[PDB]
């Protein structure tokens, strides 16, 4: 099984802050990494696919980078609606595994 380690588990930031969330894959997954946003009571929404391809409709303040084992999700300037739980997921090999999540809270 490929294990996805995300950090941090949680963080508090202010609107207009830039935030960085990392995800580490236990084995090479090339660019087969997705980032999802999950608001409370709601399902995950795909933000980024193939490590850095932003999905349509998703604000550009969201960006993904990395390859191999180390990935990053950056939100350039937080908006109120961005407070949620963020997850990375690898889809190179079954079972497709999620990181533990990062709960982003407002300061």
CSV table of C-alpha atoms in Angstrom, one decimal:
chain,number,residue,atom,x,y,z
A,1,UNK,CA,0.0,0.0,0.0
A,2,UNK,CA,1.0,3.5,-0.8
A,3,UNK,CA,0.8,5.7,2.4
A,4,UNK,CA,0.2,9.4,2.0
A,5,UNK,CA,1.4,11.6,4.8
A,6,UNK,CA,0.0,15.1,5.0
A,7,UNK,CA,1.2,18.0,7.1
A,8,UNK,CA,0.1,19.8,9.0
A,9,UNK,CA,-3.0,18.1,10.6
A,10,UNK,CA,-4.5,21.4,11.2
A,11,UNK,CA,-3.7,25.1,11.0
A,12,UNK,CA,-5.2,28.5,11.6
A,13,UNK,CA,-4.7,31.3,9.2
A,14,UNK,CA,-6.3,34.7,8.3
A,15,UNK,CA,-8.1,35.8,5.2
A,16,UNK,CA,-5.4,37.0,2.8
A,17,UNK,CA,-2.8,34.7,4.2
A,18,UNK,CA,-0.9,32.3,2.0
A,19,UNK,CA,-0.9,28.8,3.1
A,20,UNK,CA,1.1,25.7,2.3
A,21,UNK,CA,0.0,22.1,2.8
A,22,UNK,CA,2.3,19.2,2.0
A,23,UNK,CA,1.8,15.6,1.1
A,24,UNK,CA,4.4,12.9,1.1
A,25,UNK,CA,4.0,9.6,-0.8
A,26,UNK,CA,5.7,6.5,0.6
A,27,UNK,CA,6.7,5.5,-2.9
A,28,UNK,CA,7.1,7.2,-6.3
A,29,UNK,CA,3.7,8.2,-7.7
A,30,UNK,CA,5.0,10.4,-10.5
A,31,UNK,CA,2.3,13.1,-10.9
A,32,UNK,CA,-0.6,10.9,-10.0
A,33,UNK,CA,-1.8,13.1,-7.1
A,34,UNK,CA,-5.0,14.9,-6.6
A,35,UNK,CA,-6.1,17.5,-4.1
A,36,UNK,CA,-9.6,17.6,-2.7
A,37,UNK,CA,-11.4,20.2,-0.6
A,38,UNK,CA,-14.1,19.0,1.9
A,39,UNK,CA,-16.3,21.4,3.8
A,40,UNK,CA,-18.1,20.2,6.9
A,41,UNK,CA,-21.1,18.1,6.1
A,42,UNK,CA,-20.2,18.1,2.5
A,43,UNK,CA,-18.4,15.7,0.1
A,44,UNK,CA,-14.9,16.2,-1.2
A,45,UNK,CA,-14.5,18.4,-4.3
A,46,UNK,CA,-11.7,18.0,-6.7
A,47,UNK,CA,-9.5,21.0,-6.9
A,48,UNK,CA,-6.4,19.8,-8.7
A,49,UNK,CA,-5.5,16.7,-10.7
A,50,UNK,CA,-2.2,15.3,-11.9
A,51,UNK,CA,-0.4,17.2,-9.2
A,52,UNK,CA,-0.8,20.6,-10.7
A,53,UNK,CA,-3.7,20.8,-13.2
A,54,UNK,CA,-6.3,23.1,-11.7
A,55,UNK,CA,-9.9,22.0,-12.2
A,56,UNK,CA,-12.2,24.2,-14.0
A,57,UNK,CA,-14.0,26.7,-11.8
A,58,UNK,CA,-11.4,26.5,-9.2
A,59,UNK,CA,-10.0,29.9,-8.2
A,60,UNK,CA,-6.4,30.4,-9.3
A,61,UNK,CA,-5.3,31.2,-5.8
A,62,UNK,CA,-5.1,27.4,-5.5
A,63,UNK,CA,-2.1,25.7,-7.0
A,64,UNK,CA,-0.4,22.4,-6.8
A,65,UNK,CA,3.2,21.4,-7.3
A,66,UNK,CA,5.6,18.4,-6.9
A,67,UNK,CA,6.4,15.1,-8.5
A,68,UNK,CA,7.6,11.7,-7.3
A,69,UNK,CA,7.0,11.7,-3.5
A,70,UNK,CA,6.7,15.3,-2.4
A,71,UNK,CA,3.7,17.4,-3.2
A,72,UNK,CA,2.4,20.8,-2.1
A,73,UNK,CA,-0.9,22.6,-2.2
A,74,UNK,CA,-0.6,26.4,-1.9
A,75,UNK,CA,-3.4,28.9,-1.4
A,76,UNK,CA,-1.9,32.3,-2.3
A,77,UNK,CA,-4.4,34.5,-0.5
A,78,UNK,CA,-7.1,32.9,1.7
A,79,UNK,CA,-10.7,33.8,1.3
A,80,UNK,CA,-13.4,33.1,4.0
A,81,UNK,CA,-14.8,30.3,1.9
A,82,UNK,CA,-11.5,28.4,1.9
A,83,UNK,CA,-11.8,27.2,5.4
A,84,UNK,CA,-12.2,23.5,5.1
A,85,UNK,CA,-10.4,20.1,5.2
A,86,UNK,CA,-7.9,19.5,2.4
A,87,UNK,CA,-6.8,16.1,1.3
A,88,UNK,CA,-4.3,14.7,-1.1
A,89,UNK,CA,-4.9,11.3,-2.8
A,90,UNK,CA,-2.6,9.1,-4.9
A,91,UNK,CA,-4.2,7.3,-7.8
A,92,UNK,CA,-1.2,5.5,-9.2
A,93,UNK,CA,-1.9,2.2,-7.5
A,94,UNK,CA,-4.9,0.5,-5.9
A,95,UNK,CA,-6.2,1.0,-3.4
A,96,UNK,CA,-6.1,4.8,-4.1
A,97,UNK,CA,-5.2,6.3,-0.8
A,98,UNK,CA,-5.8,9.6,0.8
A,99,UNK,CA,-3.6,11.6,3.2
A,100,UNK,CA,-5.0,12.1,6.8
A,101,UNK,CA,-6.3,15.6,5.8
A,102,UNK,CA,-5.5,19.1,6.8
A,103,UNK,CA,-8.1,21.1,8.7
A,104,UNK,CA,-7.7,24.8,7.8
A,105,UNK,CA,-9.3,27.1,10.4
A,106,UNK,CA,-9.6,30.8,10.6
A,107,UNK,CA,-7.4,32.6,13.2
